[PDB]
Scaffold this active site. Structure first.
Site, PDB file in Angstrom:
ATOM      1  N   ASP A  21      -3.419  46.443 -42.015  1.00 25.02           N
ATOM      2  CA  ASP A  21      -2.917  45.598 -43.144  1.00 25.02           C
ATOM      3  C   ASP A  21      -3.775  45.633 -44.400  1.00 25.02           C
ATOM      4  O   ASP A  21      -4.943  45.872 -44.339  1.00 25.02           O
ATOM      5  CB  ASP A  21      -2.995  44.133 -42.689  1.00 25.02           C
ATOM      6  CG  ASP A  21      -1.989  43.782 -41.591  1.00 25.02           C
ATOM      7  OD1 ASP A  21      -1.244  44.640 -41.092  1.00 25.02           O
ATOM      8  OD2 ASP A  21      -1.988  42.584 -41.237  1.00 25.02           O
ATOM      9  N   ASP A  22      -3.148  45.266 -45.537  1.00 21.56           N
ATOM     10  CA  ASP A  22      -3.794  44.915 -46.836  1.00 21.56           C
ATOM     11  C   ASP A  22      -4.035  46.097 -47.794  1.00 21.56           C
ATOM     12  O   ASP A  22      -4.482  45.841 -48.926  1.00 21.56           O
ATOM     13  CB  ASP A  22      -5.089  44.111 -46.755  1.00 21.56           C
ATOM     14  CG  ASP A  22      -4.921  42.810 -45.975  1.00 21.56           C
ATOM     15  OD1 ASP A  22      -3.785  42.353 -45.812  1.00 21.56           O
ATOM     16  OD2 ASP A  22      -5.948  42.214 -45.614  1.00 21.56           O
ATOM     17  N   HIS A  76       3.897  43.972 -46.543  1.00 21.25           N
ATOM     18  CA  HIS A  76       3.033  42.853 -46.220  1.00 21.25           C
ATOM     19  C   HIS A  76       3.134  41.802 -47.352  1.00 21.25           C
ATOM     20  O   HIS A  76       2.188  41.000 -47.598  1.00 21.25           O
ATOM     21  CB  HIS A  76       1.578  43.384 -46.141  1.00 21.25           C
ATOM     22  CG  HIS A  76       0.597  42.423 -45.529  1.00 21.25           C
ATOM     23  ND1 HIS A  76       0.943  41.553 -44.513  1.00 21.25           N
ATOM     24  CD2 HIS A  76      -0.735  42.214 -45.776  1.00 21.25           C
ATOM     25  CE1 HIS A  76      -0.133  40.845 -44.161  1.00 21.25           C
ATOM     26  NE2 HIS A  76      -1.165  41.258 -44.876  1.00 21.25           N
ATOM     27  N   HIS A  80       0.464  39.068 -51.394  1.00 21.77           N
ATOM     28  CA  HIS A  80      -0.276  38.457 -50.294  1.00 21.77           C
ATOM     29  C   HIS A  80      -0.377  36.918 -50.381  1.00 21.77           C
ATOM     30  O   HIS A  80      -1.401  36.372 -50.027  1.00 21.77           O
ATOM     31  CB  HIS A  80      -1.702  39.009 -50.170  1.00 21.77           C
ATOM     32  CG  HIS A  80      -2.225  39.033 -48.722  1.00 21.77           C
ATOM     33  ND1 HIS A  80      -2.859  37.943 -48.148  1.00 21.77           N
ATOM     34  CD2 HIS A  80      -2.255  40.020 -47.789  1.00 21.77           C
ATOM     35  CE1 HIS A  80      -3.234  38.265 -46.907  1.00 21.77           C
ATOM     36  NE2 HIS A  80      -2.820  39.508 -46.648  1.00 21.77           N
ATOM     37  N   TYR A 117      -1.648  36.433 -43.174  1.00 23.63           N
ATOM     38  CA  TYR A 117      -2.304  35.379 -42.374  1.00 23.63           C
ATOM     39  C   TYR A 117      -1.478  35.006 -41.144  1.00 23.63           C
ATOM     40  O   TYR A 117      -1.706  33.935 -40.562  1.00 23.63           O
ATOM     41  CB  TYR A 117      -2.531  34.079 -43.195  1.00 23.63           C
ATOM     42  CG  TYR A 117      -3.048  34.331 -44.605  1.00 23.63           C
ATOM     43  CD1 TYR A 117      -4.353  34.809 -44.826  1.00 23.63           C
ATOM     44  CD2 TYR A 117      -2.213  34.131 -45.696  1.00 23.63           C
ATOM     45  CE1 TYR A 117      -4.824  35.079 -46.134  1.00 23.63           C
ATOM     46  CE2 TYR A 117      -2.646  34.383 -47.013  1.00 23.63           C
ATOM     47  CZ  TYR A 117      -3.938  34.868 -47.212  1.00 23.63           C
ATOM     48  OH  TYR A 117      -4.362  35.114 -48.463  1.00 23.63           O
ATOM     49  N   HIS A 178      -7.383  46.166 -40.436  1.00 21.87           N
ATOM     50  CA  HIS A 178      -7.252  46.087 -41.926  1.00 21.87           C
ATOM     51  C   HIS A 178      -7.961  47.312 -42.485  1.00 21.87           C
ATOM     52  O   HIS A 178      -9.180  47.420 -42.420  1.00 21.87           O
ATOM     53  CB  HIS A 178      -7.942  44.829 -42.466  1.00 21.87           C
ATOM     54  CG  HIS A 178      -7.377  43.533 -41.934  1.00 21.87           C
ATOM     55  ND1 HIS A 178      -7.696  43.027 -40.694  1.00 21.87           N
ATOM     56  CD2 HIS A 178      -6.521  42.640 -42.495  1.00 21.87           C
ATOM     57  CE1 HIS A 178      -7.060  41.878 -40.507  1.00 21.87           C
ATOM     58  NE2 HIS A 178      -6.352  41.610 -41.592  1.00 21.87           N
TER      59      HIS A 178
HETATM   60 ZN   LIG Z   1      -3.183  40.513 -44.947  1.00 22.75          ZN
END
Ligand SMILES: [Zn+2]
Ligand SMILES: [Cl-]
Length: 226
Positions: A21-22, A76, A80, A117, A178
């Site tokens: 992720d991210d 995602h 965010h 989250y 991540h």
């Molecule tokens: Zn995230």
């Protein structure tokens, strides 16, 4: 594949879906190279503007390589936010903005997403379902974002080993990491692959993990009327 309801594991045992992720961000090119050298496909839950802009620099090229290499690209959200805290119109906007970017990049929009989250309750889920999204959670969190220094990333590799049952026939995992953390890329990833094969698992995209043909992973086309 269920829509609008959080998914935690695979539809078959003996499978691991390594997820990231991210991104995309600085270390993502190297991660793609490492997965290629390992012949491993994975899944990326990408943002539109978080650690970097998905349309800046080489990021469009990295997104195109993800698809070229057979990795599943999921949303995602664009920026965010915690989706719970938004009105339905704002959640819809967070998803559509990202879809518009991925369409500009490589003419696709994800059907798969993961909530920032892991925060997406029944209110959030209803909206995501109305958007036809598959909501992907995790049943094995590496805590790589906490164990992100050269001398501490082993704690994340150990956590993975500890949680990955030797009972390959009765278990399967969707794994949360991540790729925006350098150590996730240059150290942890190889250990995850090594550990998962040592126990008899096969690494897979979330698409395969859920029995979903790659032709179903994306909206290939915008509908002009909704
Ligand atoms: Zn995230
Ligand atoms: Cl709509």
């Amino acid at each position: 594949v269920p829509v609008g309801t959080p998914i935690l594991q695979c539809t078959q045992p003996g499978l691991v879906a390594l997820t990231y992720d991210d991104g995309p961000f600085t270390f993502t090119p190297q991660l793609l190279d490492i997965l290629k050298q390992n012949d491993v496909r994975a899944t990326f839950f990408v943002n539109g503007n978080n650690w970097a802009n998905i349309e800046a620099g080489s990021n469009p090229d990295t997104i195109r390589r993800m698809r070229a290499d057979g990795h599943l690209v999921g949303s995602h959200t664009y920026a965010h936010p915690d989706l719970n805290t938004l009105s339905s119109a704002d959640r819809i906007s967070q998803m559509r903005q990202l879809e518009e970017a991925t369409r500009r990049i490589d003419g696709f929009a994800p059907k798969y997403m993961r909530a920032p989250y892991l925060s997406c309750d029944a209110g959030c889920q209803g909206d995501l379902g109305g958007l036809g999204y598959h909501i992907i959670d995790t049943n094995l969190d590496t805590k790589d974002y906490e164990n992100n220094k050269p001398e501490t990333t082993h704690l994340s590799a150990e956590k993975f080993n500890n949680e990955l049952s030797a009972d390959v026939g009765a278990n399967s995992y969707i794994v949360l990491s991540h790729d925006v953390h350098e150590q996730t890329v240059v150290s942890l990833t190889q250990k995850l692959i090594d550990t998962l094969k040592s126990k008899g698992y096969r690494a897979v995209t979330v698409g395969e993990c859920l029995g979903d043909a790659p032709e179903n992973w994306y909206k290939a086309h915008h509908h002009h009327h909704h």
